[PDB]
Design a protein around this ligand. Structure first.
Ligand SMILES: Nc1ncnc2c1ncn2[C@@H]1O[C@H](COP(=O)(O)OP(=O)(O)O)[C@@H](O)[C@H]1O
Ligand SMILES: Nc1ncnc2c1ncn2[C@@H]1O[C@H](COP(=O)(O)OP(=O)(O)O)[C@@H](O)[C@H]1O
Ligand SMILES: Nc1ncnc2c1ncn2[C@@H]1O[C@H](COP(=O)(O)OP(=O)(O)O)[C@@H](O)[C@H]1O
Ligand SMILES: [Mg+2]
Ligand SMILES: [Mg+2]
Ligand SMILES: [Mg+2]
Lengths: 371, 323, 371, 371
C-alpha cells in the first residue's frame, strides 16, 4: 500500500505518492470565483475554479487564498483544495491509502482538531499522520540534529531540533514571508509607475519576484551601484506584450527579510531571529546548531541568500564555532521529500493514527501522539 | 509480505539508522567501501558523529555473528552492520576519518586567528603613532589635572584609553577623545593613521585562546593516540592514514610553537605596559585595544558628522541670508 | 516675500496667497484646442484655451485633462496651466515668491522629479515645497492626529496620521473618484435616452452630478422607493433649453464609491479601505482614529456621505468605539487652507527647498527632504 | 536638609523624600524613542519620553528599559531617567539634598562605579549611599533577624540577616522576576489565538499579569479544575474594545517562579532557593529565619503566594519548626520605606559618602564604605 505525502502549503500545495523523489502535483492554493457576468449558455461554466484552473483563467476570477500565515482560514476553500488534489490531481481514493500532512509550529490546536476531523470524516482514511515541516526539512537533509529556518508564504520560523527532539521554547516564529514581500513589491512597483491592484496582478508580481529578484550581499553597496550605473536594471515582458524595467527593486524586496521595518513590521531580522533561537538553547548544543543551519522553503530560493546569511550569522555569533549554511537545491519540495522519507519506513506503522484511535479519542489523540 | 526482518536492534535505533543511511542516496556496499577506502569527501563531522552514535552493540554483534540463515532475510540495517563487521578495524577507520576532518577543521579555524593574534602582539609592541598620541594625551591630562595628585605624571596605563571617552565637556557631547581628535585633524594628521598599525590588533582575538589551545592540545593528543593505534594496526590502515596523521601532528606542533610565541609576546606585552604577568595581560589588552580602535573610529565619524553638520548649517545660514 | 499656495488638483486648480482664508483663483484644469476650422481672419484666434476661457468656449474645443489620477500626463499642458495661473490669474513674478505644491501619496517619483525641474528651471523660484495633501487636510482640521480620506478628482487615498507622524504602511490608494463617477453617469444616462459623448457633454454631466446627485443612506430601500414612486425624480435644464428628468441615478452614481464592482473594479469600498487602513495600524492608536475621520476633497461634497460613512464604519468597527466623521463645510478648499496654514509659520522657513540645494543635488533633494 | 530616597528598580522607579511613608513619585523606568521617522513641527515635540509620558504615547514609541536584571545597560537613558526624576517629578536640585540609592546584591562593580561617577560628576550630590534592597525590606519589616526574598522586575534574591549581620555567602540571587513572567505570559497567550509581538503590547500583557494572574495553592488541582470547568476563566477588555477570556494562564504564569523548567531554566524554585539559603547558614539561627520569612517587591503581590510559600517551606523544612511568612500589603513600596527609615537614622549620618571623599579616594571608596 502506497502512502500519500501531501504538504498543504500556504503558498503551494505539493502532493504525490510515498517514496518518490519528486512530488506529483505541485499547484498553488487559490480558489477562483467569477466576478463578471456569465452570458453564454451551457458549456460547463463553473461557479468556482480550483488550482491551476484558477491560475489559467485568472483574468476573470477573484482569487482566494484559504491559508493565511500558516493558519487555514477558509475551511470550505481548503476542502475544495483537498478534494481537487485527491480526485483530480492524484485520482486516488482516500479510503485505500494513508496520508501524511504538514503543520506549522506554534499552530492553534483547533486547527489540528479540524484537520484531523476533516481528514477522518469527509475523506475517510485508513490512517493519517501530522508532522512538523522543519522536522521533515531536517530529515530531507538527512541529519538528526540541526536548526531549520523554514520560510513559506505566510510564516517564517526558526526551529532547532537536537537529536530528533524539537525544542518547544526555542522555536521562534515571525509572520513575514513571500506574500508580504509580494505586497511590498506591489507597493514599490508604483515608484516607476506600474500599478498593480488586482489579484491576478499579485500572481504576475509573484512571478516577477520568483524570476528576477535576488538577495544582495551588501545592501548599501548595491544601492550605490544601482544609483550609479544601470547594470542591474532588468526588463520583464508582461503577458499583454508590455515590457517593464526594474532596477534596485530586485534586491530591495528581499531586504525586508533582513530589515523588517520596511513594511513597518517592527521585529528583528531572520538572522537575528535565528541567533536568538540558538541562544535560547543550551551552550552544549550550540556548536552543533551553528554548523547545521538548514534553510528550506521556496522563499529561500533567492540566489544570494546563503552568503549573506552566513555573513550575518558570523557577525552575530562569536568567532568560536563553525558557521555552515545547509542549502540544498531541492529545498522547495524538501518537506514533501522528508514526508516521503517518513512515508516508507518500517517503524512508522505503529505511529499511524488509525480510524479506531480517532473514534476512541476524538480528533485529540494527534496532540498527545504528534508533537 | 515477509515481516520477519530478523532485526536484532530495537525500533528507534533502526529508525535512526534508516534515517542516516538514506541520505547517502546509494547502497550500503558503497558506504562500506568508503569506510574501507577512508574516503572523507562525503563524510564530514556530523555524519561520522551520527555513525559513532549509532554504533553496533555487543549483543548485536554477537547475534549477527550467530546468524546462520540467509543474509537476504536481514534488514538493510543488519546487512549494513554485517558489511561494517566485514571491515577490519572499522571503528578505528571511522575515528581516523573523523579525527582527520576535525583536525583540518580546527587547524583552519585556529591558525589564521593565531596568526592574527601574533601579528596583533607584534604591532602592539611596535606601534609608530602610539607614543606620540600617548604623549599628547599625557600633556593634555597634565594640563587638566594641574593642582591634583594625579597630575604632573610621566605616563599612564593602557586602561586610560578606555577612560578617554568617560570625560566630557560642558555640552556633554564632545568628549575628551573627540576634542583631541578634532585638534589632531587640524595639527597632526599622522595620528589618524594610528588604526593602520592597529588593524592587526583590530577584531582582537574575539575568542578565548585557552579554549582553542586546550582543543588543539586534546586534538594533538587524540592524533598521537590514534597514530599509536594505527601503528598497532595492520599496514593497510598505516598506508592509508599515517601520512595524514604525521601532517596533522606536524601542523599542530607548529600551532603549539605558535602558541608558545604568543606566550612570549604576551610576556613582552606585559613588560611593555609595565604590568605584572600574573593578571590577564592578553585578552583584556586585545579587548581594550579593540574597544579603543572602535571608539577612535566612532570619534572620527562623529567629528566628521559634526563638521559636515556645521558646514551644512553655515550653508543654510548663508542661503537664508541671501534670500 | 509672500508665499504662494497652488493646489494642482486633478480636476481643479486652487491658487492664492499664504495666510489668506479663501483661495484666490479656483478654476478647472482643462486645455481647450479648436477642433473645427476657423474662417474669420484675425480677431485673436488662439490655438489653445486654458481654464475658464476654455470652459466658456467649450462647444468648439476638444478638452484635455493634463492630470490623470494624480499623474501629470502632458507636461506641456501643465506648463500652460502653470503659466496661466502665474501670469494671467494671479499675475505674479515667480522669481520673488516661494511656492507650495500638493501631491498625492504613492505617486510615481519622476512626476515629482519633473515638477521640481519645471519649478526650478522653467518657472524659477526662490524656494518651493511639495507636501502630502492629507497632511494639509489635517492641518486645516487643526487637530494633531486623525485619519484623512482625501478623494479628489483622480485619487481617493486613506492616510492616517497619529501625533503628527505619518504611517506609510497603512496608506491606501485607490484611483476611483469623480471623473470616473462622471464617466459612469455618462454610461447610465443612456438608459433614459440621453446620450452624452463629448468632453463638453462630460462637463455638463459633471455639472449634473455636482448639482443633483447625493449619497443614499440605504441603497436598497432608496432603490425600492425610486422603483416604486417618482418622488425622487428631479429635472435639469440643459444649456440648449432641453429638460431631462432623472430618478435613482442621483444615488446610483455615488454608490460606485461604496461598490466598485459597478465599474468592474475588484477592490472593495472606501469604508472597507478605511477599515483596512485602521486595522493596518497598531492596536493602541485606533481609538483616536475612530473618532477623528477627516473627510476632505470635493468627492465628499455629496449631502449624504457622512451618515453613510458613519453607518458603514460603525458596522465595520467593534461596537464599543466612538465613530465620528468630521465633515467641515470648507472641506473642498481644505488642501489650500492647510497649505496657507503651513506656509505661514516661521518654523517652516528652514524646511524649504532652495536653489543651492537644487544645483547641489540635482532634482533628487525632493526625495530626501520631502516625505 | 531633607534626604532623598530613589529606589531605581529594573521596571519601575519609586523616588521621593526621606522620612515619608508613601513613595512620592512612582513611575515605570522606560525610555520612549520615536519608532517612525518624522520631523514636522508639533510645537516642540520631545525627542524622548520618560515613564508616564512614554506610557501615554506608547503606540508609536520604541520603549527601552535602561536596566536589565538590576544592571543598567544604557547609561545615558538612565541619566535621562535620573534627570526626569530629579527635575520634573520631584523638582529638586541634586546638589542640595543627600540621595540614598538602592542596589541588588551580587551586582558587578562597574555598575556601582558608573553610578557613583554619574551621582558625583554630572548629577552631583552633597552625599549619597548605595544600599541593599533586602536590608531596607527588613527595615520596613521592623525586625532585625530573618531572611528576605526581594523580587523586583529582574532580580529575585534571598538574603539572610541575623542581628544586623548579613551573611554574604548565603545570599542567593536568581534572575527570574516579573519581566520574565510577562515574557512567558506573552509566550502563552498565543495558545488562545491572541498575538502580542510589540513592546507596547508588553504593557498590555503586563497589565493582564498585574490584574488577573494569581498564585495557585496547588498547581495540579487548579490545572485539573481549569481543564474540567471554565469557572476560573476571566475576561479582560483590550483598549481597542476587544474582549479576551483566559483560563489556566492566570496561574500558569506565576508557576515559573516555583518551577523554572517551564522556560527551560535549570534552576529550582524560589522556595528551594530560600530553603538552601537558610540551610547555608548556621544551625542555631535557622529557627529565626523560618519564623521571619519576609516577602517584598511587587512581584510577590499575587494573592496566593504566601500560602504556597508556607506550604512549600513546610514541606521542605522539618515539621517541628514554626513556618511564618511575613507578607505585608505594603511590600511593594517597602524598599523605599526602609530607605526612608535608613536615611532618617541619626546613626547613619556618619556613614554617608562625601564629595571630598570622592575627590580624595577617586571613584573607589564606595566599595570600602558600602557593603
Ligand atoms: N525562486 C523563488 N524566488 C522567490 N520566491 C519564491 C521562489 N520560489 C518560490 N517562491 C515563493 O516561496 C514560497 C514558498 O513555497 P512553499 O513553502 O513550498 O509553499 P507555501 O509557502 O505555500 O507553504 C511560495 O509561496 C513562492 O511564492
Ligand atoms: N457638490 C458636489 N457634490 C458632489 N461632488 C462634487 C461636488 N462638487 C464637486 N464635486 C466633485 O469633486 C471634484 C473636485 O475635487 P477637487 O477639490 O478639485 O479635488 P482635487 O483638487 O484633488 O482635484 C469634481 O470633479 C466633482 O466631481
Ligand atoms: N499589582 C501587581 N501585580 C503583580 N506585579 C506587580 C503589581 N504591581 C507591581 N508589580 C511588579 O513590581 C515591579 C515594580 O517594582 P517596585 O515595587 O515599583 O520597585 P522598584 O521601583 O524598585 O522597581 C514590576 O516588575 C511589576 O511587574
Ligand atoms: Mg510550502
Ligand atoms: Mg487636488
Ligand atoms: Mg525602584
Amino acid at each position: 500500500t502506497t502512502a500519500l505525502v501531501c504538504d498543504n502549503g500556504s503558498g503551494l500545495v505539493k502532493a504525490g505518492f510515498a517514496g518518490d523523489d519528486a512530488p506529483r502535483a505541485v499547484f498553488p492554493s487559490i480558489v477562483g470565483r467569477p466576478r463578471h457576468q456569465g452570458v453564454m449558455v451551457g458549456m460547463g461554466q463553473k461557479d468556482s475554479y480550483v488550482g491551476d484552473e484558477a491560475q489559467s483563467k485568472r483574468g476573470i476570477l477573484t482569487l482566494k487564498y484559504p491559508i493565511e500565515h500558516g493558519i487555514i482560514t477558509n475551511w470550505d476553500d481548503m476542502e475544495k483544495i483537498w478534494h481537487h488534489t485527491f480526485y483530480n490531481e492524484l485520482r486516488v481514493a482516500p479510503e485505500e491509502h494513508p496520508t501524511l500532512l504538514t503543520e506549522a509550529p506554534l499552530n492553534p490546536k483547533a486547527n489540528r482538531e479540524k484537520m484531523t476531523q476533516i481528514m477522518f470524516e469527509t475523506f475517510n482514511v485508513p490512517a493519517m499522520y501530522v508532522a512538523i515541516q522543519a522536522v521533515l526539512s531536517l530529515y530531507a537533509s538527512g541529519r538528526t540534529t540541526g536548526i531549520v529556518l523554514d520560510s513559506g508564504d505566510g510564516v517564517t520560523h526558526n526551529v532547532p531540533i537536537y537529536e530528533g527532539y524539537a525544542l518547544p521554547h526555542a522555536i521562534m516564529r515571525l509572520d513575514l514571508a513571500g506574500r508580504d514581500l509580494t505586497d511590498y513589491l506591489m507597493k514599490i512597483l508604483t515608484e516607476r509607475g506600474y500599478s498593480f491592484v488586482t489579484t491576478a496582478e499579485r500572481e504576475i508580481v509573484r512571478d516577477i519576484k520568483e524570476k528576477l529578484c535576488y538577495v544582495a550581499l551588501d545592501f548599501e553597496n548595491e544601492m550605490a551601484t544601482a544609483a550609479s550605473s544601470s547594470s542591474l536594471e532588468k526588463s520583464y515582458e508582461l503577458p499583454d506584450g508590455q515590457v517593464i524595467t526594474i532596477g534596485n527593486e530586485r534586491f530591495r524586496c528581499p531586504e525586508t527579510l533582513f530589515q523588517p521595518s520596511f513594511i513597518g513590521m517592527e521585529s528583528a531580522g531572520i538572522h537575528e531571529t535565528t541567533y536568538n533561537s540558538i541562544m535560547k538553547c543550551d551552550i552544549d548544543i550550540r556548536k552543533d546548531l551553528y554548523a547545521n543551519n538548514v534553510m528550506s522553503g521556496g522563499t529561500t530560493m533567492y540566489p544570494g541568500i546563503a552568503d549573506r546569511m552566513q555573513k550575518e550569522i558570523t557577525a552575530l555569533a562569536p568567532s568560536t564555532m563553525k558557521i555552515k549554511i545547509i542549502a540544498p537545491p531541492e529545498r522547495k519540495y524538501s518537506v514533501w521529500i522528508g514526508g516521503s522519507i517518513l512515508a516508507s519506513l518500517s517503524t512508522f506503522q505503529q505511529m499511524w493514527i488509525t480510524k479506531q484511535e480517532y473514534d476512541e479519542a476524538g480528533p485529540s489523540i494527534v496532540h498527545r501522539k504528534c508533537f | 509480505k515477509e515481516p520477519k526482518e530478523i532485526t536484532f536492534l530495537d525500533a528507534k535505533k533502526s529508525l535512526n539508522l534508516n534515517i542516516f543511511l538514506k541520505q547517502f542516496k546509494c547502497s550500503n556496499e558503497e558506504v562500506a567501501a568508503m569506510i574501507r577506502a577512508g574516503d572523507t569527501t562525503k563524510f564530514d563531522v556530523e555524519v561520522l558523529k551520527q555513525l559513532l552514535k549509532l554504533l553496533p552493540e555487543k549483543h548485536e554483534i554477537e547475534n549477527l555473528r550467530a546468524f546462520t540463515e540467509e543474509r537476504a532475510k536481514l534488514a538493510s540495517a543488519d546487512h549494513f552492520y554485517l558489511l561494517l563487521l566485514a571491515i577490519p578495524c572499522y571503528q578505528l577507520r571511522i575515528e581516523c576519518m573523523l579525527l582527520c576532518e576535525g583536525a583540518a577543521a580546527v587547524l583552519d579555524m585556529v591558525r589564521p586567528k593565531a596568526q592574527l593574534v601574533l601579528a596583533a602582539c607584534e604591532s602592539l609592541l611596535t606601534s609608530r603613532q602610539l607614543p606620540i598620541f600617548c604623549q599628547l594625551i599625557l600633556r593634555i591630562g597634565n594640563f587638566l589635572n594641574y593642582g591634583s595628585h594625579t597630575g604632573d605624571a610621566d605616563g599612564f596605563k593602557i586602561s586610560t584609553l578606555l577612560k578617554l571617552t568617560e570625560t566630557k565637556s560642558q555640552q556633554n557631547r564632545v568628549t575628551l577623545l573627540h576634542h583631541v581628535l578634532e585638534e589632531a585633524e587640524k595639527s597632526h594628521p599622522d595620528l589618524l593613521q594610528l588604526p593602520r598599525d592597529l588593524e592587526q590588533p583590530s577584531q582582537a582575538a574575539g575568542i578565548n585562546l585557552e579554549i582553542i589551545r586546550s582543543e588543539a592540545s586534546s586534538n594533538l593528543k587524540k592524533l598521537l593516540e590514534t597514530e599509536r593505534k594505527v601503528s598497532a594496526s595492520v599496514a593497510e590502515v598505516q598506508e592509508q592514514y599515517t601520512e595524514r596523521l604525521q601532517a596533522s601532528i606536524s601542523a599542530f606542533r607548529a600551532l603549539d610553537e605558535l602558541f608558545e610565541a604568543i606566550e612570549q609576546k604576551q610576556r613582552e606585552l606585559a613588560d611593555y605596559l609595565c604590568e605584572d604577568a600574573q593578571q590577564l595581560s592578553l585578552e583584556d589588552t586585545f579587548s581594550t585595544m579593540k574597544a579603543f580602535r572602535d571608539l577612535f573610529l566612532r570619534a572620527l565619524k562623529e567629528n566628521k558628522d559634526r563638521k559636515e553638520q556645521a558646514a551644512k548649517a553655515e550653508r543654510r545660514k548663508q542661503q537664508l541670508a541671501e534670500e
